Design an enzyme around this catalytic site. Sequence first.
Site, PDB file in Angstrom:
ATOM      1  N   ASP A 139       0.822  -1.206   0.000  1.00 15.50           N
ATOM      2  CA  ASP A 139       0.000   0.000   0.000  1.00 15.50           C
ATOM      3  C   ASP A 139       0.860   1.261   0.000  1.00 15.50           C
ATOM      4  O   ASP A 139       0.568   2.217   0.696  1.00 15.50           O
ATOM      5  CB  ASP A 139      -0.918  -0.012   1.251  1.00 15.50           C
ATOM      6  CG  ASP A 139      -2.006   1.040   1.212  1.00 15.50           C
ATOM      7  OD1 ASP A 139      -2.403   1.482   0.141  1.00 15.50           O
ATOM      8  OD2 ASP A 139      -2.494   1.445   2.287  1.00 15.50           O
ATOM      9  N   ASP A 167      -3.614  -2.984  -1.830  1.00 12.36           N
ATOM     10  CA  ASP A 167      -4.649  -1.941  -1.837  1.00 12.36           C
ATOM     11  C   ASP A 167      -4.630  -1.195  -3.163  1.00 12.36           C
ATOM     12  O   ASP A 167      -3.658  -1.230  -3.908  1.00 12.36           O
ATOM     13  CB  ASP A 167      -4.387  -0.919  -0.750  1.00 12.36           C
ATOM     14  CG  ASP A 167      -5.566  -0.025  -0.478  1.00 12.36           C
ATOM     15  OD1 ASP A 167      -6.717  -0.396  -0.815  1.00 12.36           O
ATOM     16  OD2 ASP A 167      -5.373   1.102   0.091  1.00 12.36           O
ATOM     17  N   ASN A 168      -5.742  -0.564  -3.450  1.00 12.09           N
ATOM     18  CA  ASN A 168      -5.834   0.431  -4.483  1.00 12.09           C
ATOM     19  C   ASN A 168      -5.619  -0.143  -5.912  1.00 12.09           C
ATOM     20  O   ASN A 168      -5.172   0.562  -6.859  1.00 12.09           O
ATOM     21  CB  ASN A 168      -4.883   1.589  -4.279  1.00 12.09           C
ATOM     22  CG  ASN A 168      -5.043   2.279  -2.953  1.00 12.09           C
ATOM     23  OD1 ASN A 168      -4.083   2.345  -2.181  1.00 12.09           O
ATOM     24  ND2 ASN A 168      -6.236   2.733  -2.634  1.00 12.09           N
ATOM     25  N   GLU A 197     -11.454   4.655   0.280  1.00 15.16           N
ATOM     26  CA  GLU A 197     -11.640   5.121   1.667  1.00 15.16           C
ATOM     27  C   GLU A 197     -12.376   6.447   1.687  1.00 15.16           C
ATOM     28  O   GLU A 197     -12.023   7.393   0.959  1.00 15.16           O
ATOM     29  CB  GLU A 197     -10.288   5.256   2.345  1.00 15.16           C
ATOM     30  CG  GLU A 197      -9.233   6.108   1.626  1.00 15.16           C
ATOM     31  CD  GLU A 197      -8.258   5.279   0.848  1.00 15.16           C
ATOM     32  OE1 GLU A 197      -8.588   4.182   0.341  1.00 15.16           O
ATOM     33  OE2 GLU A 197      -7.065   5.674   0.747  1.00 15.16           O
TER      34      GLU A 197
END
EC number: 2.1.1.6
Length: 213
Positions: A139, A167-168, A197
């Site tokens: 991340d 993530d992402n 988020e």
Amino acid sequence: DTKEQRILRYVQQNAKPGDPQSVLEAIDTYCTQKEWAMNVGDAKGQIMDAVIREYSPSLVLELGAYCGYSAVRMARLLQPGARLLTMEINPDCAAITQQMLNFAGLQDKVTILNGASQDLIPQLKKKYDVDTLDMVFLDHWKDRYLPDTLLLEKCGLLRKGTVLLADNVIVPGTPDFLAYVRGSSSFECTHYSSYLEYMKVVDGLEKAIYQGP
Ligand SMILES: Nc1ncnc2c1ncn2[C@@H]1O[C@H](CSCC[C@H](N)C(=O)O)[C@@H](O)[C@H]1O
Ligand SMILES: Oc1cc(-c2ccc(F)cc2)cc2cncnc12
Ligand SMILES: [Cl-]
Ligand SMILES: [Cl-]
Ligand SMILES: [Mg+2]
């Protein structure tokens, strides 16, 4: 002061010392009501929690700490004696992370390494006495996902069953990483669709399980 300093102060003044859950809530509330920040957040956090509880990792590596949100999130679910190492290139964020972990009472479970992941990963075996990793949370900057995964393999840090959680993968996205692991017989991949988020924007996590050479 910075946004990161304001997050930490808010936590100190609105959460309970030694209560990781109240720290997450406080960060989530500040970032929802006051100022957006790049914490993994509660939507994706809940999927992380499910993964962590499934595998009960003894040694986790995090790439990218920021203010310590994800480190608190993972560390609170670790079993006694289990450990997190988190790498952070920005010294101001490393200092915020340490203070966040201290406030949460998770400092004995976590080691924050201030430096670039590409420099620190080759030191894990010798300097930090690591054998192999059980889980890696990726991340940090999105252009490092692929190079750092290949580096982790090169350094002998992955074993059969090591869980990469990224993530992402939608926003900002990590196209080279995603195409690589999904195309490789060395990874078993699963996509978990979620939301950026604090936003009504689709995002997701990729779980890529290392299968050996
Ligand atoms: N090569 C690198 N090595 C270590 N940290 C890096 C890096 N490139 C970027 N970073 C750091 O990665 C972070 C991404 S934000 C991380 C948020 C955190 N995982 C959470 O969910 O709460 C930033 O703090 C940035 O300074
Ligand atoms: O979760 C994250 C989100 C974003 C981000 C930024 C701007 C935007 F518009 C959307 C998303 C950037 C990040 C960088 N490193 C780690 N995590 C990140
Ligand atoms: Cl990025
Ligand atoms: Cl959220
Ligand atoms: Mg992120």
